[PDB]
Amino acid sequence: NLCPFGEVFNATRFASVYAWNRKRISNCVADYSVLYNSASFSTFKCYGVSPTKLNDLCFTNVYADSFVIRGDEVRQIAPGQTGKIADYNYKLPDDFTGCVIAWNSNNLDSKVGGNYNYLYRLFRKSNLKPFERDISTEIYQAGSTPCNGVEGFNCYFPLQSYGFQPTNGVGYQPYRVVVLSFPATVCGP
């Protein structure tokens, strides 16, 4: 049994960050040197480990989180960061142990005229806790009069589309992100 990393990285469609995907990786042998030693990933940052020595380590079991965000937001997917993505979408703990991988996906997730399928959470009154997933679509009450389910003044939809176009500057282009969180059932070769 070899770990199903192709199903995570090479998946046809990715999740939106507010509804990020989480896959458990259990009782398989994992090759991380395939991942680190390539030209593919513009971000490949490891915390608590070295990318060099990823194969010769064992974990209780591993989680592969994945989603799509714009490029200049990929820096929010690190321990200690703040911002709309880190505060209201996907939050890493301060003591995170694992690796954060991200590559440009303009050729997969961009559409002419705008891909409005990917969304992020814009409004929220408290920050998410580490590894929280919030998928509520309640109207956001920014004033005192209750909203009663209809957008208007001081009543906003909490989610916003990215609208990825192939002609955007690459800072605004979609990036696919995989976060690897690290008995014992998941080992290297």
Partner: antibody, heavy 117, light 108 residues
Framework: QVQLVESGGGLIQPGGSLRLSCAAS????????MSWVRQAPGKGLEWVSV???????FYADSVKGRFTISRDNSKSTLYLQMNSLRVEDTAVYYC???????????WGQGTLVTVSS | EIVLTQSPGTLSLSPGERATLSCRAS??????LAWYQQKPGQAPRLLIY???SRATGIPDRFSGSGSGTDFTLTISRLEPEDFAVYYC?????????FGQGTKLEIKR
């Protein structure tokens, strides 16, 4: 109907401190993005600081380390604490409601901060 | 730090005519562009957001167009109260930045 009124501006010497306040009505300040934007005389607008609806804060590089944005929902008040003021901090300071850290859809009237020996 | 260059510096027209104000960015800001009006001694008022959406209560003669690196504010049927200073503001990248303003003065 939104209303914002800034107060606290006056003459301070370089190195001195000053706390600007902005009274707000028409919305809940603790569930909204809010910004300070300054305009030096005869010149253009410069963003100073933003507090997110969740409490995170961000500052222009000109002022990080010496300005602190904060808020009290009890009093419906936004605050800009300013320490180690420099002469190029002289400006009218506006408090503004911020739509998702994108743009400024409501502005106060402005309070004038003069920094000079 | 995206720099917004506004043109012209001063524009001199008479009431009833058409005003075309341009904002040009040092980098692409997609649609993340807003326009503000400021009369002397008053605060800015939001006019346009998302390059082309009008703010609440803004008359129909105000309209934005453009994208990427070039944006235009057009005021179609000028009225005395429309002569003021106009600012653009990008929110594509942080920090958010303003242009240096275009002043619209009455020609007599």
């Amino acid at each position: 109907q939104v209303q914002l009124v800034e107060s606290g501006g006056g003459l301070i010497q370089p190195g001195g401190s000053l706390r600007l306040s902005c009274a707000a009505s028409g919305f809940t300040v603790s569930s909204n993005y809010m910004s300070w934007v300054r305009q030096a005389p005869g010149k253009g607008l410069e963003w100073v600081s933003v507090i997110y609806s969740g409490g995170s804060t961000f500052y222009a590089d000109s002022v990080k380390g010496r300005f602190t944005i904060s808020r009290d929902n009890s009093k419906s008040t936004l605050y800009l604490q300013m320490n180690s003021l420099r002469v190029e901090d002289t400006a009218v300071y506006y408090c503004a409601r911020d739509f998702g850290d994108f743009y400024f859809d409501y502005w106060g009237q402005g309070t004038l901060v003069t920094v000079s020996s | 730090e995206i720099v917004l260059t506004q043109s012209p510096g001063t524009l001199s027209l008479s009431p009833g005519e058409r005003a075309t104000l341009s904002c040009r960015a040092s980098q692409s800001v997609s649609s993340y562009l807003a326009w503000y009006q400021q009369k002397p001694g008053q605060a800015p008022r939001l006019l346009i957001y998302g390059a082309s959406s009008r703010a609440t209560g803004i008359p129909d003669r105000f309209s934005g167009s453009g994208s990427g690196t070039d944006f235009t504010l057009t005021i179609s049927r000028l009225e005395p109260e429309d002569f003021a200073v106009y600012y653009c503001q990008q929110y594509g990248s942080s920090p958010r930045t303003f242009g240096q303003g275009t002043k619209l003065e009455i020609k007599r």
